[PDB]
Design a protein around this ligand. Structure first.
Ligand SMILES: OC[C@H]1O[C@H](O[C@@H]2[C@H](O)[C@@H](O)O[C@H](CO)[C@H]2O)[C@@H](O)[C@@H](O)[C@@H]1O
Ligand SMILES: OC[C@H]1O[C@H](O[C@H]2[C@@H](O)[C@H](O)[C@@H](CO)O[C@@H]2O)[C@@H](O)[C@@H](O)[C@@H]1O
Ligand code: NA
Length: 342
């Protein structure tokens, strides 16, 4: 009825600061991105003006605040989401190491598991990826909240297409020069499916990924994030021994930090958009689902509770006519439907 689902992975961001913990409102303050097609300015992260079109129920919180982390784990329990997929940027700073330890300890108190979402950090390549996979498994592999499926850790790899299949083969083929296959550091490696099947099918096969995900909460942003393609993507995956983990989300809007990106807006329609994405994932017959996102406030994809808020700087969007915790409860509903279908 209410147990956590360990085939549901929710993308989680630990880059927020507060004056209480960090001494600064990190990420609530954020540079405005220049138009790809310029002195754009910065959102200052004051109470009135934050880097989101929405406004958190918990305010300008710190991701290093143990009291905030506790409340977040309670929110995961409400949503029935059993795995927290943690953004990881290879910052190599004491604050990063501290935050990962706090998140693991908080998660374990509510039986939530943690896996890593490997980001496009500077000069990312298959050698430093191996070195960082080994570090992460050695440092956190014995923590009880560290996620495993059939004895293997799992990693999502954002913008995996930035590395050529001839490089991925070295790490992920059983014969690869620096392979993790059949070693103590073997893992499930889930790459990002973006574009058409004529490009993606050979990429995934040649790179030796164990599976693929789609990430984007905005329908139609890519081929992969267009749900009418998911039945055929699942059929191809099952035929080729690959795990398909489609990404579902409640909406998208990023125009505070990207004022030129309005065409990517997807409206929430009081939950109906989320319902349509989640239904299509379940209908495709997949064995795992990813949620974009718990708390990407910059991109307006969050299921974390939000509240009404107005200032002279900006009038924020909010969840009305639904209540602030609607997207947590609606997640729990769809987790129930997914479990019926497995
Ligand atoms: O939204 C601003 C944010 O964009 C980039 O991070 C990416 C986004 O969070 C989103 O597309 O998800 C990706 C996978 O988790 C992630 O790479 C970065 O440029 C970041 O610094 C920025 O704050
Ligand atoms: O430029 C806006 C766009 O930025 C990010 O996506 C970029 C890249 O990371 C993606 O792999 C490709 C997919 O086609 O698009 C961009 O180049 C995301 O933050 C995205 O949500 C945003 O719209
Ligand atoms: Na699982």
């Amino acid at each position: 009825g209410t147990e956590l689902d360990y085939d549901t992975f929710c993308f989680y961001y630990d880059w927020y600061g507060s004056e209480a913990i960090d001494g600064q409102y990190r990420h609530w303050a954020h540079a405005i991105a220049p138009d790809p097609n310029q002195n754009p300015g910065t959102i200052p992260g004051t109470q009135e003006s934050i880097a989101s079109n929405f406004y958190p129920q918990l305010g300008r919180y710190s991701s290093s605040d143990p009291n905030i982390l506790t409340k977040h784990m309670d929110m995961f329990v409400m949503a029935r989401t059993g795995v927290l997929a943690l953004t990881w940027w290879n910052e190599q700073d004491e604050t990063e190491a501290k935050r990962i330890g706090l998140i693991l300890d908080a998660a374990d108190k509510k039986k939530i598991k943690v896996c890593f979402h490997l980001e496009p950090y500077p000069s990312r390549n298959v050698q430093n990826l191996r070195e960082n996979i080994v570090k992460l498994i050695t440092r956190y592999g014995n923590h009880p909240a560290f996620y495993r499926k059939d004895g293997k850790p799992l990693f999502f790899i954002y913008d995996s297409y930035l590395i050529e299949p001839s490089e991925w083969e070295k790490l992920l083929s059983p014969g690869g020069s620096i392979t993790i296959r059949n070693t103590a550091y073997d893992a499930l490696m889930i790459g990002l499916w973006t574009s058409s099947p004529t490009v993606q099918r050979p990429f995934i096969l040649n790179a030796h990924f164990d599976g693929f995900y789609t990430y984007f909460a905005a329908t139609g942003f890519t081929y992969g994030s267009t749900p009418t393609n998911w039945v055929s993507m699942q059929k191809w995956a099952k035929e080729n021994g690959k795990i398909f983990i489609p990404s579902v989300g409640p909406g998208y809007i990023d125009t505070r930090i990207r004022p030129w990106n309005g065409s990517v807006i997807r409206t929430r329609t009081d939950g109906q958009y989320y319902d349509a994405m989640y239904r299509k994932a379940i209908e495709a017959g997949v064995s795992a689902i990813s949620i974009t996102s718990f708390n990407q406030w910059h991109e307006g994809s969050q299921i974390e509770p939000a509240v009404p808020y107005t200032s002279s700087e900006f009038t924020y969007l909010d969840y009305e006519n639904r209540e602030p915790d609607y997207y947590l409860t609606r997640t729990a509903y769809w987790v129930g439907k997914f479990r019926e279908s497995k």
